Amino acid sequence: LSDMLQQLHSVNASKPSERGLVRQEEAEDPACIPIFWVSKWVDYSDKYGLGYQLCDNSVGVLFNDSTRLILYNDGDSLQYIERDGTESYLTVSSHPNSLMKKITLLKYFRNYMSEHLLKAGANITPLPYLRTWFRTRSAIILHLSNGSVQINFFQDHTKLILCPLMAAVTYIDEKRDFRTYRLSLLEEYGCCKELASRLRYARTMVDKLLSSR
Amino acid sequence: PLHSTA
């Protein structure tokens, strides 16, 4: 998270959209395509919590009591993470009676997402959990346990997936075209105003994450 | 009450 903030400061300070010939294509690094992003989500936190589906079709829920339930894409294998960080590995078919409510909620959330929501990055060629999230008027901000930070913009449906380990960013535009860039290469070659503006917002969002952990 | 793109 700290390194992500530094990577973004570096690219933003280079003023990528306002210093001559933009060579954005040359900043593309297809090697740095993320393995994991959030494809779907449901904000039901007024009662239960926030459910999400990862790109591999695995599902997760961050409940209001700060516990997490993670269903792997085989549809049975389960991970549970308590408040104190205690991780438990099991299956739905073998759950203790105590997790009954939470499993039911996950399966409900799973069904809605699978049946009624669009898969983000469905055209991208093919386990972390949700550490934290918040919502603004403009965007939902998703912080995964592998360090990745995703930002989905509500109004135009454009999305950023920020990968601190690769020092990279994947951008999904209004047409659902995806391009993955190395951040230092965006510094080297520049980019359009659209990407530049969302990266400035991204830095502000990472700063909010860092100030609220 | 809110969700990702339908």
Numbering used by the authors:
A (entry chain A): 374 to 499, 508 to 594
B (entry chain B): 1 to 6
Task: Give verbatim excerpts from the published study on this entry.
As a prototypical example, we focus here on the polo-box domain (PBD) of polo-like kinase 1 (Plk1), a serine/threonine kinase that is overexpressed in a wide range of cancers, and is a known anticancer target due to its critical role in mitotic progression. Recently, a secondary hydrophobic binding site proximal to the primary phosphopeptide binding site has been identified by two independent approaches. The walls of the hydrophobic PBD secondary binding site comprise Tyr417, Tyr421, Leu478, Tyr481 and Tyr485, with Val415 and Phe482 lying at the bottom.
Here, we show that although opening of the pocket is highly unfavorable in the absence of a ligand, it is possible to identify all of its known ligand-binding modes, as well as a novel mode, by using a modified ligand-mapping technique. The previously unknown binding mode was used as a basis for the design of a new ligand with similar affinity to others binding this pocket. The predictions were validated by solving the crystal structure of the bound complex. In addition, in some of the simulations, we observed “half-open” conformations of the pocket not seen in crystal structures. These conformations are involved in a new “half open” binding mode in which a benzene molecule lodges in a smaller cleft formed by five of the hydrophobic pocket residues: Val415, Tyr417, Tyr481, Phe482 and Tyr485. To further validate the simulation results, we designed a ligand to present a phenyl ring to the pocket in the half-open conformation seen in the simulations. Based on the known structure of FDPPLHSpTA bound to PBD, the new ligand was modeled by replacing the N-terminal FDP residues with a 3-phenylpropanoyl moiety, which incorporates a minimal aliphatic linker between the phenyl group in the pocket and the truncated peptide. We synthesized the ligand and determined its KD to be 330 nm by isothermal titration calorimetry (ITC), comparable to that of the significantly larger FDPPLHSpTA peptide (250 nm). We have also used this ligand-mapping approach for the first time to design a novel high-affinity ligand, whose binding mode was confirmed by X-ray crystallography.
